[PDB]
Amino acid sequence: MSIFIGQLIGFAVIAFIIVKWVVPPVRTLMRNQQEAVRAA
Amino acid sequence: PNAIITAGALIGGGLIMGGGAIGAGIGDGIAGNALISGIARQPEAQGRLFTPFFITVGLVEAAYFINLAFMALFVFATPGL
Amino acid sequence: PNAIITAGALIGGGLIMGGGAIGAGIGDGIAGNALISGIARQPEAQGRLFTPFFITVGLVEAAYFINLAFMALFVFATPGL
Amino acid sequence: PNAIITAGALIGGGLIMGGGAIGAGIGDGIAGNALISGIARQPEAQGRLFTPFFITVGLVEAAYFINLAFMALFVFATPGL
Amino acid sequence: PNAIITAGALIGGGLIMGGGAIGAGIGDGIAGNALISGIARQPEAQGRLFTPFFITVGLVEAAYFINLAFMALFVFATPGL
Amino acid sequence: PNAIITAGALIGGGLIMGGGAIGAGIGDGIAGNALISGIARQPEAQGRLFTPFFITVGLVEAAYFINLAFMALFVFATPGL
Amino acid sequence: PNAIITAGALIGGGLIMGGGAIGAGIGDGIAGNALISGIARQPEAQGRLFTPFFITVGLVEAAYFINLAFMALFVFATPGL
Amino acid sequence: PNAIITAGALIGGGLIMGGGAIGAGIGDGIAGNALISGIARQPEAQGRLFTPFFITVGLVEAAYFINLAFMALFVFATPGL
Amino acid sequence: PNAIITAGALIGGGLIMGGGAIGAGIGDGIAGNALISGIARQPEAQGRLFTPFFITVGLVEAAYFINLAFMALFVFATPGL
Amino acid sequence: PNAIITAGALIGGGLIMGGGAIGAGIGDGIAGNALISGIARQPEAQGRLFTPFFITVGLVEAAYFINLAFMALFVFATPGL
Amino acid sequence: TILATAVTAVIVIALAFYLRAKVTSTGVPSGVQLFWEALTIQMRQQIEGSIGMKIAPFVLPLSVTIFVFILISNWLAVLPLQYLYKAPASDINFVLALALFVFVCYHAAGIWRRGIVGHPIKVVKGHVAFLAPINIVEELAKPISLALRLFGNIFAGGILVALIAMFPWYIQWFPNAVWKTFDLFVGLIQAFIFSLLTILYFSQSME
Amino acid sequence: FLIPNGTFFAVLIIFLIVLGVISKWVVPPISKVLAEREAML
Numbered sequence A: 001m002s003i004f005i006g007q008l009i010g011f012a013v014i015a016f017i018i019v020k021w022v023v024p025p026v027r028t029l030m031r032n033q034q035e036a037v038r039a040a
Numbered sequence B, C, D, E, F, G, H, I, J: 001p002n003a004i005i006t007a008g009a010l011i012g013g014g015l016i017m018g019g020g021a022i023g024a025g026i027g028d029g030i031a032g033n034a035l036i037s038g039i040a041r042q043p044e045a046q047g048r049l050f051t052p053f054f055i056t057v058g059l060v061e062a063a064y065f066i067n068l069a070f071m072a073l074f075v076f077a078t079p080g081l
Numbered sequence K: 001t002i003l004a005t006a007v008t009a010v011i012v013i014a015l016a017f018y019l020r021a022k023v024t025s026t027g028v029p030s031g032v033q034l035f036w037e038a039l040t041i042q043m044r045q046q047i048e049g050s051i052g053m054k055i056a057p058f059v060l061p062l063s064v065t066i067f068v069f070i071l072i073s074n075w076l077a078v079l080p081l082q083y084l085y086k087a088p089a090s091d092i093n094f095v096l097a098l099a100l101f102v103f104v105c106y107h108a109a110g111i112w113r114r115g116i117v118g119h120p121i122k123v124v125k126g127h128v129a130f131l132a133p134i135n136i137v138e139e140l141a142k143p144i145s146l147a148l149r150l151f152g153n154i155f156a157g158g159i160l161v162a163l164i165a166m167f168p169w170y171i172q173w174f175p176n177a178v179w180k181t182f183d184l185f186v187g188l189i190q191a192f193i194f195s196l197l198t199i200l201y202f203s204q205s206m207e
Numbered sequence L: 001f002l003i004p005n006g007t008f009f010a011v012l013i014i015f016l017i018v019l020g021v022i023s024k025w026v027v028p029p030i031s032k033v034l035a036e037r038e039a040m041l
């Protein structure tokens, strides 16, 4: 049980980090490609 | 008894991981040096250098982690016991 | 008895941390050499060069953290025994 | 008894594989330095620089996996026994 | 008895400090080299390069301190007893 | 018993091959770099450089095989057993 | 008896002074190379360029002294004797 | 008895050839690097640059053979048997 | 008996000079490399370049002789004997 | 008996000569590299460069030969015997 | 283990299903279109750079399936199933099947190109005849290098996630978080490495 | 842990299943799409 408690805490931490730092640039690049397709 | 063999196995696996560590660290550094230097010479080259970079970093790591796959084999699965 | 395996474990963990520290220091240093020279060459590239630098440092420090983990394994968990 | 021989075989094999990882990593990295720097300083060369690189990496891997090969012989067959 | 463990423990602590010091000296030098060459190429560049440098040093020296801690654990706390 | 003489041998041989691997691994690289960079800078010279290269490796490899040879001598033939 | 402890302690202390001396020599050399080259390329620099040097040397040589101290601790005040 | 001395002899003889092969391989590779990077500039350099290279390779290899000789002296007709 | 401590002492002392000679050779080689490169790229600066090199080597050798002295302490006047 | 110390002595002499040979080979190589590189450029310079190179080697081998000498002390006179 | 891989096959298959549903060449692409297209176009620019799409087009599907397969495997290894899931590459069987199939495919394509009587000798003699006996080890190295690497790294994680679990939970959350954070990156990089070296081995196998 | 079993053929079969799925479903429509984007450009 205990290692699961720590695991879920850690998974929340990693999801937090990706959501805050990694997701914005990824989605912005995806949106840039999306709009560049929107040109045609 | 088996204890002698196991002490030897820990020592051997330690040599494996230590050499792999030296190799992988120094190699990843030598590669990152060329990468940083190219990006300093051409700030726009970043999108281009990732290809030759990870070709290197992998072929470098292709030692360390391989050693690691054998390290466990010595420590956790002692041959010839 | 177990004492011998423990002694082998201390020695092996020492070799692991030794190789780890050699690799980590020399690699972070080579990367820093590239960064220092590039920031000496392009005062403005600082923000772009911090990226490949943290990537290289991340790889080498991953090697060192894996080595530290297997050191804790040898010394405290002492496989076999 | 033959336990000592087994411990020695593991230790020597570990030395083999560790030195192999050191050399292979550092060599692949030094080669990647030339590759990355050439691809940074001229991208049209990406087609040709891949030729000597794997000519050299091959010479380096063809050391690693040879050492590893003998390492297996050390650990699984134990030549002297 | 504990005697063998303690002998191995001293040997391991020494291997740790040794690898650590190799890494630390060579890395601090590789950083000072970029710093010196840059400060030669640009006298007024000091106030920039010290930032990447104390960064690089901070990594390399950290590899030392951690080792210096664990050496104590090996030698002045003797795990496994 | 006489087993000890073999044990050190399997250790000793590793020091011949493993360190040899280092000389093989880095040298094949440091040379290829000078090759690769040439192919980057002076593309027409791809033929000329191959001779200064094959001699360099020709020497470096000359060590490795020799070590390999004596490796077998330690492991299979076991002097003074 | 404790004799084995003193033997291990001398081995460890030798490893500490050894790694320390490797780091010291090679790092002071990598620094002095930047110094010689920087006083060739910019002969007036001698005044400012000594300061960064005294920094990197300060970090390398210190790693030696902290090493040379702990050797003295290993051998003359053997932990756990 | 003689067995222990013989094992020590093979181990020392492994160390000696290993260090020798390391020095020889890396030095020969560095000399080859200088030669290859020089012959890259102007072809007419060949017959000229061969003179220093065979000097460097002459000294570097001059270490290996000498070490190799001492290697035999350890393993064949070992001191103190 | 005293045999074990003398053996450990000799082994440690050899490690001391091995590491010392690695440091000294590679360090003074790098120093001489900078000196040669500078006296090539700037012969007018010859008399300048000799001032730092004797300083640089002075530190490198300063470490090695210090090591040899401690070697005499380990081998002849073994601590703990 | 003195057999134990003799094994330690052979191993220690091997360490002395190994580190010495690593240093000598890599140092002669790094010096010859500067020589070959400063003779590829401006060959009329060569007569200057022989003065510092033979100085640098003079130091490198000054470390090596004396190492060999201390080896002869460990192996043929075995301090503590 | 087979179930740990079946989950990844079904995710990748459902993604191909979603693409088959969504694709639009006129309109604005959804996420799945952009991910698929970026991977395909990267590998296509790579193969175009060395062999040319017209000589060896059959490598693109293999490369992309390898990349998605191992990438999804490693990323799924991150999800907090710790307490059944373990990365499949942790088992030699998976990495062996993958590397061995890559090996047999590109070698059989070389044979198909030059012929069964022609390709082996040309591969042995390789780039420089003086290296003929090394090329064999360079050849025999090609598959093994692929396998023991992808194993060695992901296995290195499978153990470590367990070793960290040795901690108490409060200490545990920090190393596990850092490790998985950088393990996403390391798995992605090893996938890119596997695919790119597969492409390069195909290329040099043709010439 | 380096001794294979029948797990091997199972992973080879599932990997080839995914490969067929991809080669038929994914690659063709995306190549057609790349061509049509190069046209509309």
Ligand SMILES: COc1nc2ccc(Br)cc2cc1[C@@H](c1ccccc1)[C@@](O)(CCN(C)C)c1cccc2ccccc12
Binding pocket: C024, C057, C058, C059, C061, C062, C063, C064, C065, E059, E060, E062, E063, E066, K174, K175, K178, K179, K182
């Ligand atoms: C910069 O910090 C990092 N960056 C990483 C980047 C990538 C990866 Br994959 C792992 C990284 C891990 C870390 C630390 C860390 C964070 C969490 C847990 C364990 C370790 C670290 O390992 C860094 C030391 N470095 C220089 C060797 C560490 C180890 C031991 C004691 C420390 C004391 C103080 C500070 C750091 C300490």
Ligand SMILES: COc1nc2ccc(Br)cc2cc1[C@@H](c1ccccc1)[C@@](O)(CCN(C)C)c1cccc2ccccc12
Binding pocket: D059, D062, D063, F024, F058, F061, F062, F064, F065, F068, K130, K131, K133, K134, K137
């Ligand atoms: C071509 O390379 C060489 N050049 C040399 C130059 C001088 C001298 Br005197 C010896 C040389 C020997 C070789 C090889 C060779 C090829 C064929 C036969 C014998 C030797 C090699 O040594 C490769 C080592 N490399 C990769 C670090 C080797 C040794 C042993 C077993 C091998 C098995 C497979 C492949 C290579 C094998």
Ligand SMILES: COc1nc2ccc(Br)cc2cc1[C@@H](c1ccccc1)[C@@](O)(CCN(C)C)c1cccc2ccccc12
Binding pocket: E024, E057, E058, E059, E061, E062, E064, E065, G058, G059, G062, G063, G066
């Ligand atoms: C620059 O120094 C550092 N940088 C770091 C960078 C990152 C991290 Br995370 C930890 C760092 C820690 C330090 C010192 C320190 C400062 C305060 C307390 C404890 C340790 C150090 O450990 C460094 C030794 N170096 C120079 C080989 C030290 C220990 C003992 C005696 C010293 C005597 C003199 C100088 C440094 C001394």
Ligand SMILES: COc1nc2ccc(Br)cc2cc1[C@@H](c1ccccc1)[C@@](O)(CCN(C)C)c1cccc2ccccc12
Binding pocket: F059, F062, F063, F066, H024, H057, H058, H059, H061, H062, H063, H064, H065
């Ligand atoms: C380059 O050749 C040399 N240059 C020297 C230069 C200076 C001095 Br002082 C001694 C030198 C000695 C030699 C060779 C030699 C050849 C024949 C007889 C005696 C000595 C060598 O010892 C070199 C080993 N290298 C490659 C690590 C050798 C020994 C054994 C087998 C070899 C097989 C192939 C090639 C060289 C072989």
Ligand SMILES: COc1nc2ccc(Br)cc2cc1[C@@H](c1ccccc1)[C@@](O)(CCN(C)C)c1cccc2ccccc12
Binding pocket: I024, I058, I061, I062, I063, I064, I065, I066, J059, J061, J062, J063, J064, J066
């Ligand atoms: C120039 O040499 C030095 N520079 C130093 C620099 C700093 C310091 Br702090 C100590 C230094 C010490 C010396 C010599 C010395 C010895 C005894 C007394 C005084 C000076 C030396 O120990 C150096 C050997 N080197 C290669 C390690 C030596 C010993 C034996 C034979 C030699 C033969 C020839 C030359 C030097 C010889």
Ligand SMILES: COc1nc2ccc(Br)cc2cc1[C@@H](c1ccccc1)[C@@](O)(CCN(C)C)c1cccc2ccccc12
Binding pocket: G024, G057, G058, G059, G061, G062, G064, G065, I059, I062, I063, I064, I066
């Ligand atoms: C430059 O020298 C230093 N720089 C340091 C830098 C940082 C720190 Br924190 C400690 C430093 C300490 C010193 C010396 C020292 C020793 C005792 C007391 C005071 C200073 C030194 O320990 C350095 C050895 N080097 C040269 C390998 C030394 C010891 C023995 C003999 C020497 C002979 C000659 C020169 C130095 C000698």
Ligand SMILES: COc1nc2ccc(Br)cc2cc1[C@@H](c1ccccc1)[C@@](O)(CCN(C)C)c1cccc2ccccc12
Binding pocket: H059, H062, H063, H066, J024, J057, J058, J059, J061, J062, J064, J065
């Ligand atoms: C180049 O020769 C030197 N230059 C020096 C320069 C400075 C100093 Br302070 C000491 C130097 C010492 C020497 C030789 C020497 C000269 C005289 C007597 C004893 C030893 C040497 O020790 C060097 C070995 N090298 C090449 C790895 C040697 C020993 C044994 C056999 C050799 C065979 C061939 C060549 C050198 C041989």
